[PDB]
Every structure is written in structure tokens, then in C-alpha cells.
Design a protein around this ligand. Structure first.
Ligand SMILES: CCC1=C(C)/C(=C/C2=NC(=C\c3[nH]c(/C=C4\NC(=O)[C@H](C)[C@H]4CC)c(C)c3CCC(=O)O)/C(CCC(=O)O)=C2C)NC1=O
Ligand SMILES: CCC1=C(C)/C(=C/C2=NC(=C\c3[nH]c(/C=C4\NC(=O)[C@H](C)[C@H]4CC)c(C)c3CCC(=O)O)/C(CCC(=O)O)=C2C)NC1=O
Ligand SMILES: CCC1=C(C)/C(=C/C2=NC(=C\c3[nH]c(/C=C4\NC(=O)[C@H](C)[C@H]4CC)c(C)c3CCC(=O)O)/C(CCC(=O)O)=C2C)NC1=O
Ligand SMILES: CCC1=C(C)/C(=C/C2=NC(=C\c3[nH]c(/C=C4\NC(=O)[C@H](C)[C@H]4CC)c(C)c3CCC(=O)O)/C(CCC(=O)O)=C2C)NC1=O
Ligand SMILES: CCC1=C(C)/C(=C/C2=NC(=C\c3[nH]c(/C=C4\NC(=O)[C@H](C)[C@H]4CC)c(C)c3CCC(=O)O)/C(CCC(=O)O)=C2C)NC1=O
Ligand SMILES: CCC1=C(C)/C(=C/C2=NC(=C\c3[nH]c(/C=C4\NC(=O)[C@H](C)[C@H]4CC)c(C)c3CCC(=O)O)/C(CCC(=O)O)=C2C)NC1=O
Ligand SMILES: CCC1=C(C)/C(=C/C2=NC(=C\c3[nH]c(/C=C4\NC(=O)[C@H](C)[C@H]4CC)c(C)c3CCC(=O)O)/C(CCC(=O)O)=C2C)NC1=O
Lengths: 162, 172, 60, 49, 162, 172, 162, 172
């Protein structure tokens, strides 16, 4: 997973030398901003259920037609799977926050995302709307640089979906 | 690769004598049902995504341990690999159907697929069940008489089921 | 001297192909590479950077 | 008021307007830059490679 | 394009050899199947207006939630673009029939299909429904080998969408 | 490829002198505004799909000849190539914005791109127009004061405009 | 071996795609051409012995010095080898006719042909003239399209030799 | 590389139009005479060594300066390259006769050929002479009425002559 410390090690290994000051600087930069990212992760992990349910309801509101008989929204198992999917996205957002890298998102969502969505006929716009709700909520659930961390990761996921 | 015509030629060459009248008659019959074979291959091709989706849905409803975290198909990448493997197995099966020989499927894929699945940690009975579900999904499309003239293709169904079950048993 | 390396492609390589993609056709995981002594260090470190896991290295 | 145009030209006009979806409209016009899909690779001579 | 003649000649050239029996028999099959293919192209070209308007209407029936204001289908311009797109698909299907190879479909529709749809947020299921309607109507307009040819190319386009 | 720091280092090296106190103060001020610079780079990176969708919509509404049969963006392939190019140039603009120097943009993106578009028969003026529209959309997105601590950032806006204009002038 | 069907399947597998219109049209051409080809194979299998005897004698008339003592054709063993070789060529021609592909001739005669004949000092013109005689009696023996198929395979062999 | 069908399709696409009835009729005519085209291609392919041998003999009988020490075909290497060139031009003329369009020649066979010949110092006049000699030798085998049904194949003869002429004119 492409954590910044991991990318440090990978680049130093690829160029076949020790850790010069250049990537020590980057590792330091991560180590300082770990605090806002970790507190954002904790805040997200606390409010997870409300965020998941609100994302589901925002999805159904923006796409009222989905819930109607005959397509993906209808069927209680389908709403259950919706809640589970926003739960997964939130979980990997927390992972990417605590790891200070898009690595968890990259290797747990984005990798293989389009083929999966295409094969199961799941609209990426559903998840874009859910993550938009999550972003709106975390805009007030967090303050300071932790908010910037959370918004960067949530929007990286959003751009991945689009 | 090797075809049924190629197979017969190989057997004749091993004994080093001309193809016998019985062999020529069998190959002429094969060329006579070649049109039906083309229809069967087109049926497999034109509904391949539907076959994959139906097999995947039935398999994952049957076995939820693959969906759940820690399963062998949990993240998006492992799901995509699952679907790609089903797709490639179907493609090779249709190749065997068109040629009439199982060599195109047996040669490159099934020999090393065993070691690959063992190394990666995939449940092999799960993949065999996936291929069997693919066969079950594909038989309906092979039967569909709409848009084709009504006829009998029991040999084609037998051979296609043979290829499907052979690949499933190989990976098993 | 020649050294034969039996490399098994594993999840570490599968993740890299899932991220970067397949600009080259997909292949079976287990294959053997034969190297001279001069090339053994670069080829083996390259196989490590690719995430491949070597199984056996035999000399010949 | 009789036919103002002979039937052959009406047929020719109808078939010219039929071979194009929507007939002749202001939005379905061809592009003045008449570039086929293969324009660049063909004019460069790199189609094969 | 990747028509029978062109792929024959290209593979012959890439091996630096003349056209042998295999290639000439493939070309002969192409020249024989020309007749049903040109007949299908005639049938579809004569009936392009009814086919395309029916396809647009079928899309608007299977996707009622598109016509209302606030989304893609609302407005005369968007519906005109709908009809134009289905006319494109049908045009390239008739081109494929005339050329006896998916080359026109591939080059003009399939290459760049997913990226373009994602960029403009055009749901492939719309065009799948339109092409399914066109498949149904060609079941009635065509008979025999002409129907099989037309359906083969329509299904190629649909599989490319899904 | 070099940033503002290495630019100063190169000018100092050609003379053969240490960096002057004024130069060091300039670089330190750059480092102190680097946080706002990161904000602007993130504004570009986050809203790239919206920027390019908007610029594409305006470009093809303004220049309809590109998207109609025969046009340079007509089939799906060439439309995808167009949108991909917009992606690329926006990417390199953001790179240059972070570095503080347009060297990466000019060296790795813009340099032989006029020649490419001449050889392919692509309208370089239309590409410059697309870069300009994408400039305007990007400027709308940078100036967004939401979720970011408020303060003067006019220097960054002007610098990003210079980068976009340089891209447009090189392509055209 | 190189058949029509094998070229189909290899072209489809090399691009990682399914069999489609162009490839099924090639296969249909193969299946249509099977009847003359199987007919020609049958007619040539009936008259293998007379054809081989005539071809050997044709070579001996055309290259009379070969039969001279101290040359290649002198001795019953060498003439038995000649008859065996002409029989080999005829058998592989029949195989190629059945397979609707030059794959049999290629794999079993043409691959390695020049080096083997160079090593054993076998003049290709001998076999060319023998195949010319076989081509001559194919006109008498076969008529219709089986005639053309047999002649084109024999011409493939002759082109390989020459 | 186009055939006649793809050329018609490209024009129809540029117009944005379906293929007109008369276009479909000309195409049905082309495919209905496709059997004679296949016979002509077989005649060119099957007799290619003979064509090249005869053209070569006549060319070096006319132009002895090519095979004198200092000539452009003097050592074995240059003579072998010359014969390969004749082989290649005949190959591509057969490709164009099969497709019915001379795009394959200018796309592949004659792409940079004149520049090649100029840089090597090859006399382009002698190359065009060699192509004319091959054309003459090929016409003999194209009119050969043995083993084929008698019929009117003058369009094929003229088309092949024009392909040979297009080559010999592009080199020269
Ligand atoms: C850890 C990474 C991961 C993700 C993200 C994931 C999502 C996901 N959800 C699925 C099912 C589903 N997911 C939905 C989602 C819809 N439900 C509606 O209420 C909403 C409009 C909408 C959600 C916003 C639906 C309807 C299904 C059932 C149809 C199907 O895909 O088979 C499927 C198909 C197979 C399955 O059941 O698991 C996937 C792959 N799976 C994963 O392993
Ligand atoms: C010759 C043709 C060919 C085949 C057939 C083939 C199979 C193949 N499957 C692989 C992984 C995989 N294959 C599967 C599929 C199975 N696992 C279960 O979950 C499913 C029920 C089941 C699908 C029916 C999965 C999930 C992986 C991912 C394993 C991992 O990433 O650790 C890999 C490792 C490469 C990679 O993951 O990128 C190969 C090579 N490769 C080939 O070149
Ligand atoms: C463009 C590619 C291509 C296709 C698709 C193709 C199919 C094809 N199907 C045919 C009829 C047929 N098709 C079938 C097969 C069907 N019968 C039953 O309904 C089965 C459910 C089903 C098999 C899955 C049969 C049995 C025939 C009639 C053959 C006969 O007995 O004479 C025919 C002969 C029609 C005639 O001359 O009367 C062709 C050429 N040929 C091609 O060149
Ligand atoms: C060569 C083949 C080719 C195709 C197929 C093609 C499709 C296509 N249709 C477009 C417009 C569009 N097309 C539609 C179609 C929708 N309208 C609704 O009534 C329907 C439900 C639905 C159709 C089934 C819409 C909504 C747009 C506008 C998208 C936008 O720019 O916002 C666009 C965007 C370019 C533009 O601004 O015109 C493309 C690329 N383009 C091509 O070059
Ligand atoms: C993880 C990557 C990263 C981000 C996202 C980041 C943003 C960031 N912006 C900051 C302040 C700031 N950010 C801005 C920039 C804004 N001024 C206007 O509103 C513009 C719309 C906009 C930029 C064009 C300004 C003016 C300040 C306060 C002055 C300063 O501290 O430099 C701060 C310091 C604490 C704070 O006051 O919020 C951070 C951490 N820094 C980082 O290392
Ligand atoms: C510098 C290297 C080099 C060599 C070695 C060479 C040999 C050579 N000899 C040739 C003609 C020939 N060479 C011979 C030689 C035969 N005459 C018979 O009396 C003998 C049995 C036998 C010689 C022992 C013959 C018969 C021809 C005419 C072949 C023909 O016209 O097709 C040709 C064909 C073109 C021509 O010159 O007319 C070549 C290339 N050319 C070269 O540039
Ligand atoms: C395996 C590859 C393959 C080949 C090569 C092939 C040739 C072929 N030649 C044919 C007859 C023919 N062949 C020719 C051409 C000849 N007429 C002579 O006068 C000219 C010297 C020469 C060229 C003008 C003609 C004119 C016909 C009869 C007319 C026609 O079939 O339309 C036919 C139609 C059969 C018939 O109706 O009798 C075929 C299919 N078929 C194949 O499947």
C-alpha cells in the first residue's frame, strides 16, 4: 500500500541507495500531520452508523426511482447491501486517514472498481452521492486540518468513482 | 492448436497412411453440422456477459464467505479477478466448442491454472462450482430457439457440457 | 555459472498488476528464469521489486 | 396547381434526404473538416505499425 | 477496418507471405455472405426513421425517470441528441453489415466508449435498451440469414456496451 | 525539470556565487506561502473531472464542427483522445503549480505537442481554446473559499493563469 | 495446425476476445468449402498408387541422367525412396484438403524442407516435376471445385519447393 | 489499408449518411464477382516465382549494367535484395487485387520506398522496369483459361495493370 513512508522506501530501493535527507524530509512531514489524520479517523469511526444511514437516505432521495419495484433499490437485501457498501467506503476512508496515504483506498476500492460496477450494474453515481453526503457531514463533524485530511481522502474516493 | 480435422490427420500420420473412408465420412458429417456449431458458438458469445453475471450472482448467493471481508473475493480487485477468470474460462470453452477439440482449452490454461490457484489461495471447489453454474446458465441460451430455425443439436449440448465439466474438473 | 530461478507470482505481484494494469498479456504464476552469474543479482532484485516470490534457485 | 417538379427529381431528393437520419437539418450537418476516423495515422503512414 | 479481407491481408503481411488457401476461403465466405448482409443493410436503411424513433421511445419508457426536468433526458436538445446517438449506432451497424466485420463498430463506437460515457455521464443501459428494441424490430423486418447477420452485429454492440 | 529553489540555484551557479540574502528571503517567502500553494494544488486535483467536463461542454458547444461526422473529435476514439489530452495538460499544470516553476510543464508536456497536433491534423487553435476554458473553470475552483482558511492568494491565481496561458500559447 | 478454424481461434485468443462476425464468416466459408475438399481427398486417396507411379516415371523422363549409375536415381532402393517421397507429398496434400488448410503441408513437409534437401542433395526440381504430373492428372480425375482445391494445394507445395 | 467496402463506408460516414441504394448495388456487384477476383489472386499467388524469375531474366538481359561489378545488383547480397523486392511488390499487388483498393500499396509497400531507393542509390528507373516486366509476366497467368471457368475478367486485368502501374509510378 502506497503509504508515504512506503513510497520513501520504494523510491530509495529503486534508486538503490540509503535514505538521504530528501525522503527523511517527507517522512517527517507525514509524522507531523499524523495527528490531524488520526483524530479525523477516530471522529469518523465514532459517527459511522449515522453517516452510513444518512448516505443511504441521500442516495434514495437524489435517485427516488431506484427504490421502486423492478430495479436495484427494491428488495430489503439491496438496502442492506447499500448500507454495507457505504460502510466499506467509510472504513477504507478511515484506513487511508490512519495510514496517511491513499493506499488502503487504492487497493481496497479503486483497484478493480469499474469492472465490478459494470458487471453488477451498480451506478457509480449512487456512491458519488453517498460520499457527497459524507463529505457534507464531515465538514461539520471535523474542524481544522483534520477536516482538510478527511476531505482530501473522501474526494479522492469521489474522483475514483467518477 | 489442434482441431478435430487436425486430430484425425495426426492419428493418420502416426500410422502413416491415408485417411480412411470412415474418417472422411465422420469429418464430412462434422462439416455438415458446422452450421449448427456456428450457431451454438454465437449463442455462447452473444450472451457471455449475461452468463457471467448469472453464474456470479448464483455463486455468491450460494457462498457468502467469498463476499464477506477476509474471503477470497472480498475487495474489488479480487472480485474483478474472479469475473475475469470466469470470462476467460467461458472464452476457452467457446473456443473448444467452435473447434470441436478440447486442446485449445487444455493446452495453455488448465495445465498451469492448478498451480496458480493453489499458490494464490483460492478455494478450488468454489471455482469448480462457478464453472458449473456457468454451464447451467449457458445451457439456457444454447437451447433458446428464438431467431434460429428449429432443429436438433443434442450433440452440441453434450459436447459443450463436456467442455464445461472438463474445465471444472480440471481446476477441481 | 548459470542459475535457474523458479519464481511464483503471488498476491504482491497481483496487487501491482491490479493497480498498474496489464500492458502485457496475463500469464501463469509459476515459471522458471535462467540467468548467468553476472545477471543473477539484477534479475533477482528485479523480481523482488516486482513483488514476485522466488521458490527455488538451482545452479547448473 | 400541378406538379411543379418532375417525379424523378422528387424521388432523387427523397432518397437523398432518406439516406441521412432526420433528413437535412441544421444540427445533423457533416463536419466541414472532413476527417475520417483514420485520417491522422493514414496521412502519417503509421497505420500498420 | 477489421473486416475479413483486411484482417486476412494484414495477417498475411505480418508473416511476409502471400494469400494461401485459408485466406482465400475466408474471403470466399465473406463474398457469399455479402448477399444476406447487404439485404439486412437495405432493410435497416429503408426503415431508419421508424427504428430510431421507436428506440428513443422505448428508452423513454424503460427509463421514465430520465424525461423529467433536472436530469439528462429533459429538453428538446437532449432528446435530439438521443435520436442522433441511436442513429449513429444503427448507421455503424449497417456499415458493419455492408463490410461484413465489426471493424466499423469497433473503430467508431467501441474504442473510447466507456471513457466517453463516463465523461458525459451517459448510462450504457439506455443504449442497451435502444439496441434491444432495434433487435426486436429487426426480428420482424428481416428473415432468414439477414436476421441472423443483423442480430449478430446488434449483439456485438450490446455486449460492448455492457 | 526543476522548481523555484533549483532555478535560483542554477542562476547562482552560472555566476559562480552564493545565493544572495535577497534570493534566500525570496525562497523563504515561497516556503512560507507553500501551504496556500498546496491548497491550490489540491483544489486543482480534486475538481479535475468537473473542470474538464465543463471545458469540454463549452468547447463543443462553441465549436460544433469537432463533434459532427468528419470532425476531429467525432468518433468515440477521438473524443476520448480529446478528453484525455485535457486531463494530461491539467495534470502538468498542477505539477507546475506545486513546483513553482513551469519547467515540468514545458519540458515534459508542451514541448513537441504542436508538432504532434500538426502531424495528426488536430486543430491546435481548438486545443488552445480548450486549455483556456479549462483555465477559467480551474480559476472558479481555486477561488472557492469553502473548507479552506481564508486569506489573500492573488499571487497563486496569477501564477496558475500564467501556467495555463503558457500551455495555450505553446500548443497554438 | 494452420486451418481456417485455428486461424480464427488464434486471432480471437491473441486479442483476448470472443469469436465474432468476421471469424464465424471465415468458419462458414470453411464449412461450405469442405464438400469439394473432402471430395478431392476421396478421389486422390482412390488413385494414390497410379499417381505416384506416374509421378516417379515423370521425374525419370524429365531428368534422365538421374537414373544413370553413380547418380541419385540409380538402384532400386533409391527409386523406392522416390516413390515413398511422392507418396508422402500426396498424403499431406490429401490431409491439407481435408483440413481446409495448408497446415499439414506446412508442418509436415515445408518446415525443414530446404535444409533437409540441401543436406541430402535432393534437387527440388524433381519433386516439382512430380507434383506437376500430379497436377496434370488432377485435372482429368477431378472436375468442379474439388479440382480447384486440389490444384491450389498442389500449387502451394510447388511454390514451397520452388 | 481499406478494401472497397470500407472505402464506401468511410465516404458515407463523412457525409454522415447511410449508404445509398446505388452504393449498396455497386458493392453487391463487387461481391458477386468476387469469385473471379479470388481466382485472379490465386493465379498471381501460385505463379509468383515464375513471374519474378521471368521479370528478373528480362530485366538483367536488358540492363547488364546492374550485374556488372559496380552495378546496383552486383554481389549476391544486392541481387538477393532485388529479388526480395520483386517478391514484395508482387505480394502487395496480390493483396490489392484481393481487397480491390490500392490503399495497401501506398500504406505499406510504397510508404517510404522511393526515399529508400534514393538513399541506397538504387536506379528507380530499373525498378519501375522490373515492375512492368512483372506486370507483363503476370498478365499471362491471369488470362490463363485452364482450370477455370471461361468468363469475362477484363476488369480484373485492367485493375491489376493499374496496381502494377501505381507501384512503378510511385517508385519512379
Ligand atoms: C470492500 C469493497 C466492496 C464493495 C464496495 C462492494 C460493493 C458491492 N455491492 C454489491 C451488491 C449490491 N449493491 C447494491 C447497492 C445499491 N443498493 C441500493 O440501495 C443503492 C442505490 C445502492 C448503493 C448506494 C445493490 C442493489 C446490490 C445488489 C445487486 C448486485 O450487485 O448483485 C456487489 C455485488 C456482489 C455482492 O453482493 O457483494 C458489490 C461488489 N463489494 C465489495 O467487496
Ligand atoms: C491461461 C488463462 C489464465 C487463467 C485462467 C488465469 C487465472 C489467474 N487467476 C489469478 C488470480 C485470481 N483468480 C481468482 C478467481 C477465483 N478465486 C475465487 O474467488 C473465485 C470463485 C474464483 C473465480 C471463478 C481470484 C479471486 C484471484 C485473485 C487472487 C489474489 O489476488 O490474491 C491469477 C493471478 C494473476 C492476478 O491476480 O493478477 C491468474 C494467473 N490466468 C491466465 O493467464
Ligand atoms: C454470420 C455467422 C453465421 C451464423 C450465425 C450462421 C448460422 C446458420 N444457421 C443455420 C440454420 C440452423 N441453425 C441450427 C441450430 C439451432 N437449431 C436449434 O434450434 C438449436 C437450439 C439451435 C442450435 C444452438 C440448425 C439445426 C439449423 C438448420 C441446419 C439443418 O439441419 O439443415 C444456417 C443455414 C440456413 C440455410 O441455408 O437454410 C446458418 C448459415 N452462419 C453463419 O455464417
Ligand atoms: C461515433 C459514435 C458517437 C456516439 C454514439 C456518441 C454519443 C454522444 N452523445 C453525446 C451528447 C448526449 N447524448 C445524450 C443521450 C441521452 N439523451 C436522452 O434523451 C436519452 C435517454 C439518452 C440517449 C439514449 C445526452 C443527454 C447527451 C448530452 C450529454 C452532455 O454533454 O451533457 C455526446 C457528447 C458530445 C456532445 O456534446 O454532443 C456523445 C459523445 N458520440 C459519437 O461520436
Ligand atoms: C495535506 C495537504 C495540506 C493541506 C490541504 C493544507 C491546507 C492548509 N492551509 C492552511 C492555512 C491557509 N490556507 C490558505 C489558502 C486559502 N486562502 C484562500 O482562501 C484560498 C481560496 C485558498 C488558497 C488559494 C491560507 C490563506 C491560509 C492561512 C495563511 C497561512 O497559514 O499561510 C493550513 C495551516 C492551518 C490552517 O490555518 O488551516 C493548512 C494545513 N496544508 C497541507 O500540507
Ligand atoms: C560477385 C558474386 C556473384 C556471383 C557468384 C554471381 C553468379 C550469377 N550467375 C548468374 C547467371 C548464370 N550463371 C550460370 C553458371 C552456369 N553456367 C553453366 O554453364 C555452369 C554449369 C554453371 C557454372 C559452373 C548460368 C547458366 C547463369 C544463367 C542463369 C539464368 O539465366 O537464369 C546470375 C544471375 C544474374 C546474371 O548474372 O545474369 C548470378 C547472380 N553473381 C554475382 O554478382
Ligand atoms: C479456395 C479459394 C477459392 C477460389 C480460388 C475459388 C474460385 C472460383 N471460381 C469460380 C468460377 C469462375 N472463375 C472465373 C475467372 C476466370 N475465368 C477465366 O476466363 C479468367 C482467366 C479468369 C479470370 C477472369 C470465372 C469467370 C468464373 C465463372 C463466373 C462466376 O463464377 O461468377 C467460382 C464459382 C463456381 C461456379 O459457379 O462454377 C469460384 C468459387 N473459389 C474458392 O473457394
Amino acid at each position: 500500500s502506497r503509504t508515504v513512508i512506503t513510497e520513501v522506501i520504494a523510491t530509495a530501493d529503486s534508486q538503490g541507495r540509503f535514505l538521504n535527507s530528501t525522503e527523511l524530509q517527507a517522512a517527517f512531514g507525514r509524522f507531523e500531520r499524523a495527528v490531524p489524520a488520526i483524530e479525523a479517523a477516530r471522529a469518523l469511526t465514532k459517527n459511522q452508523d449515522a453517516l452510513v444511514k444518512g448516505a443511504v437516505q441521500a442516495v434514495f432521495k437524489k435517485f427516488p426511482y431506484v427504490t421502486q419495484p423492478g430495479e436495484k433499490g427494491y428488495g430489503d437485501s439491496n438496502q442492506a447491501k447499500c448500507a454495507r457498501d457505504i460502510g466499506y467506503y467509510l472504513r477504507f476512508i478511515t484506513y487511508s486517514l490512519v495510514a496517511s496515504g491513499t493506499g488502503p483506498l487504492d487497493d481496497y476500492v479503486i483497484a478493480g472498481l469499474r469492472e465490478v460496477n459494470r458487471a453488477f450494474n451498480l451506478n457509480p453515481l449512487w456512491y458519488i452521492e453517498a460520499l457527497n453526503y459524507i463529505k457534507g457531514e464531515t465538514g461539520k463533524l471535523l474542524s481544522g486540518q483534520s477536516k482538510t485530511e478527511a476531505l482530501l481522502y473522501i474526494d479522492h474516493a469521489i474522483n475514483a468513482l467518477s | 492448436m489442434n482441431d478435430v480435422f487436425t486430430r484425425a490427420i495426426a492419428q493418420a500420420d502416426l500410422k502413416g497412411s491415408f485417411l480412411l473412408e470412415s474418417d472422411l465420412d465422420k469429418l464430412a458429417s462434422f462439416a455438415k453440422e458446422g452450421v449448427k456449431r456456428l450457431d451454438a458458438v454465437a449463442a455462447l458469445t452473444n450472451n457471455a456477459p449475461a452468463i457471467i453475471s448469472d453464474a456470479a450472482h448464483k455463486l455468491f448467493a450460494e457462498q457468502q464467505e467469498l463476499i464477506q471481508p477476509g474471503g477470497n473475493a472480498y475487495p474489488h480487485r479480487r472480485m474483478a479477478a474472479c469475473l475475469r477468470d470466469m470470462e476467460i474460462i467461458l472464452r476457452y470453452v467457446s473456443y473448444a466448442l467452435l473447434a470441436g477439440d478440447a486442446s485449445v482449452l487444455d493446452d495453455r490454461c488448465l495445465n498451469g491454472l492448478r498451480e496458480t490457484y493453489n499458490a494464490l489461495g483460492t478455494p478450488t471447489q468454489s471455482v469448480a462450482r462457478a464453472v458449473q453454474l456457468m454451464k447451467d446458465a449457458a445451457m439456457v441460451h444454447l437451447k433458446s430457439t428464438a431467431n434460429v430455425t428449429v432443429g436438433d443439436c443434442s450433440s452440441l449440448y453434450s459436447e459443450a457440457a463436456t467442455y464445461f465439466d472438463k474445465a471444472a474438473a480440471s481446476i477441481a | 555459472r548459470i542459475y535457474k530461478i523458479t519464481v511464483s507470482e503471488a498476491g504482491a505481484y497481483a496487487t501491482n498488476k491490479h493497480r498498474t494494469g496489464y500492458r502485457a498479456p496475463i500469464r501463469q504464476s509459476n515459471y522458471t528464469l535462467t540467468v548467468p552469474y553476472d545477471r543473477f543479482l539484477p534479475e533477482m532484485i528485479r523480481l523482488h521489486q516486482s513483488g514476485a516470490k522466488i521458490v527455488n534457485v538451482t545452479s547448473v | 396547381m400541378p406538379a411543379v417538379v418532375a417525379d424523378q427529381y422528387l424521388a432523387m431528393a427523397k432518397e437523398l434526404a432518406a439516406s441521412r437520419f432526420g433528413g437535412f437539418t441544421k444540427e445533423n450537418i457533416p463536419s466541414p473538416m472532413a476527417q475520417p476516423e483514420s485520417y491522422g495515422r493514414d496521412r502519417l503512414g503509421i497505420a500498420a505499425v
